[PDB]
C-alpha cells in the first residue's frame, strides 16, 4: 500500500514534494540554515517505482548530519562528484539532473545552437540557463565545472553531451545494481520493471504483464548490464528509430523482433540480444499477436 502511494508521488506530485519525500539528509552548518540533500541512492529511488522509502525518512523526515574531510556518498568516478565533493544532490541539481536524463540529445543540440552567440553550439552561463529553462518548459560546483572558476568560460555541446551520456550511464548502472544482480545479471522481471518505469505508463494491465514475466522465462538466465544498457540506448534513439521505420508505417506493418534488431543496430548502433527482445515483446505485446504495434511500444516510448 505504501509503495502505491509513493508511486503516485513519483507520477503526480511536484518536484518539491518528490524531493522532500525521497531525500534522506538535512545538513546543518550553523549559522548557515539547513539544506536537504538526496544521496545518489535517493535520487535513483525517486525515479524507480515500487522502491520503499526508509520507514522513518518519509515526508519532511531526514537523517540529521552536522579543511576537514567530509563524508562521501558516491562510488569512485561517479558523475555525482561533478556537483561537489560529496556526491550529494541539492534540490536545484535534482531539477537539472532529471531534465538532462530525459531530454533527447537532439533537442540539446538545437537549443545550444539557437540561443548561443554564433550558432556553434557553445553557450556561456546565461545562455545555458536560457537553454535549461526552455528545455524544462518543453516538458555552483557544477556551474564552475561547466564554465570555469571565474564563470567566464563557455560550454560546448560536445562536452555537455559527454556529461549527459556519463550521467545516463551512471544512473542506469546504479539502478541495475539496486536490483541486486546475481553474477552480473538481473531477472527478466526486474528488467521489465525498468521498462515500465521508463515508459511512465500507469496501467494495471502492463503491471500484470510485468509480473507474469517470471512465468514466461522459467529458464531464468537474466540480463547482463550490457544487454540492459543496449536496450536503453535504443530507447534514447526512439525518435530516429521511428523515422527509420517509415516504410513499415506506410505498409501498416507492426514491429517484429528481427526488425527491432535491424533498426537498433542500424540507427542506435547497438546489438540487441534475442533474449532482451523476447522480454520486451513479452512485456508490451498486450494483444498477444507476436508483434508490437505502434500503440503497444514505439508510441508509448515516444510520448513518455
Amino acid at each position: 500500500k505504501v509503495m502505491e502511494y509513493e508511486n503516485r508521488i513519483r507520477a503526480y506530485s511536484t518536484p518539491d514534494k518528490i524531493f522532500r519525500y525521497f531525500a534522506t539528509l538535512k545538513v546543518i552548518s550553523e549559522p548557515g540554515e539547513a539544506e536537504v540533500f538526496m544521496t545518489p541512492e535517493d535520487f535513483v529511488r525517486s525515479i524507480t517505482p515500487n522502491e520503499k522509502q526508509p520507514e522513518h525518512l518519509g515526508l519532511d523526515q531526514y537523517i540529521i548530519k552536522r579543511s576537514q574531510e567530509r563524508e562521501k556518498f558516491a562510488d569512485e568516478g561517479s558523475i555525482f562528484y561533478t556537483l561537489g565533493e560529496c556526491g550529494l544532490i541539492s534540490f536545484s541539481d535534482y531539477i537539472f539532473l532529471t531534465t538532462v536524463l530525459s531530454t533527447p540529445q537532439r533537442n540539446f543540440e538545437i537549443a545550444f545552437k539557437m540561443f548561443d552567440l554564433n550558432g556553434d553550439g557553445e553557450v556561456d552561463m546565461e545562455e545555458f540557463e536560457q537553454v535549461q529553462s526552455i528545455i524544462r518548459s518543453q516538458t555552483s560546483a557544477l556551474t564552475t565545472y561547466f564554465f570555469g572558476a571565474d564563470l567566464k568560460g563557455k560550454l560546448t555541446i560536445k562536452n555537455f553531451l559527454e556529461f549527459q551520456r556519463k550521467l545516463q550511464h551512471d544512473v542506469l548502472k546504479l539502478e541495475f545494481e539496486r536490483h541486486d544482480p546475481v553474477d552480473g545479471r538481473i531477472t527478466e522481471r526486474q528488467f521489465g520493471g525498468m521498462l515500465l518505469a521508463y515508459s511512465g505508463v500507469q496501467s494495471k494491465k502492463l503491471t500484470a504483464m510485468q509480473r507474469q514475466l517470471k512465468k514466461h522465462f522459467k529458464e531464468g538466465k537474466g540480463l547482463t548490464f550490457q544487454e540492459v544498457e543496449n536496450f536503453f540506448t535504443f530507447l534514447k534513439n526512439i525518435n530516429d528509430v521511428d523515422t527509420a521505420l517509415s516504410f513499415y508505417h506506410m505498409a501498416g506493418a507492426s514491429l517484429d523482433k528481427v526488425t527491432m534488431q535491424q533498426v537498433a543496430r542500424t540507427v542506435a548502433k547497438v546489438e540487441l540480444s534475442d533474449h532482451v527482445c523476447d522480454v520486451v515483446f513479452a512485456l508490451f505485446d498486450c494483444d498477444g499477436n507476436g508483434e508490437l504495434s505502434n500503440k503497444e511500444f514505439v508510441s508509448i516510448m515516444k510520448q513518455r
Partner: protein, 290 residues
Amino acid sequence: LRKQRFMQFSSLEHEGEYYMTPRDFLFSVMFEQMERKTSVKKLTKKDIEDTLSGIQTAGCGSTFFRDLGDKGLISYTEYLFLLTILTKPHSGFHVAFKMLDTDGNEMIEKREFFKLQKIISKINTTLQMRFFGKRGQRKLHYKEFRRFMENLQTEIQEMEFLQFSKGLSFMRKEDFAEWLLFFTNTENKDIYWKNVREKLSAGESISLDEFKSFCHFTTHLEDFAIAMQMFSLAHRPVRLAEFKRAVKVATGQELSNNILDTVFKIFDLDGDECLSHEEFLGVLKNRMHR
C-alpha cells in the same frame, strides 16, 4: 491506405496486381487527381519483358523516370518505397540502405530488396532491373543507391519547378506560392491566397537552384519545428532573423531572399512582420504528405 491512390493512378494490370509506369508514378507525386480517368491495359507476361527491355536508353541521372515515361513498371511495394525516399533528408539515405542490407556485406541484393514485398504480402520491374539485372545478377552498392535517391529527389523538384513555372525559366513568386499551397485545402486558405494576390510583388523571380534549396529544407522539418517551438516557449516572436537561424540550425544552409520574402508575405498574418509559424508548418506538412 495509400493503396486506393496507387490503383487510381496505375495504368497497368497483370494477374490481379496493378502497376504504375514511371509516368504514372511521377503524376501521382505531383497531382492529387488524374484530371482524366486512366485506361488500364492488361499485360501478358510478353508485354512485361517488352516493357522492361529498354532501360538501357533512359538516363542514369535526374531524368531516369521522365526518360522512361510509359516504358516501365513499378509495383505497389516499390511505389511506397519511392515515396518514403522523397521525404528523407540526405542523412536518411544511408539508414535506408543499411536497413535493407541485412547481412551487412554493404551491398543490397535482389533477395534483400524482396523483403519489402514480403512485408507487403504479409513480377520483374523497372527498379529490380536497374538495381539487380534480370536474374538478380547485379548487386547494388551504396554509392549507386545514394545517387539514385538524390536523383529521384532532384527529378521531382525539376519536374515540379517547370510544372508550376508553366515552362518559364524562372518561377514567379506567385508560381512558387501556387506550388507551396497546392496541397492546402484548410479553413484558413483564403487568407493565404489573399496575401498571394495582393502582397506578392513582381520582385526577383526564383531560380531552379533557389527552389531546390527550399525543397531540401522541407526534408528537415523535424528540427525546424523543434526550433520553432523553442522560440515560442521563449516568447520570442519569429521574425526574419529568428527564421533564418532556425533554418540554418535545421539545415546548415541559407534560403534566398525572394523565397524568405514570399514566405513572410504569405504567412505574416498579423501585420507586425512576425511569422505565423504554426500555419506555415501546417502548409509544409501538407506539401510533404502530398
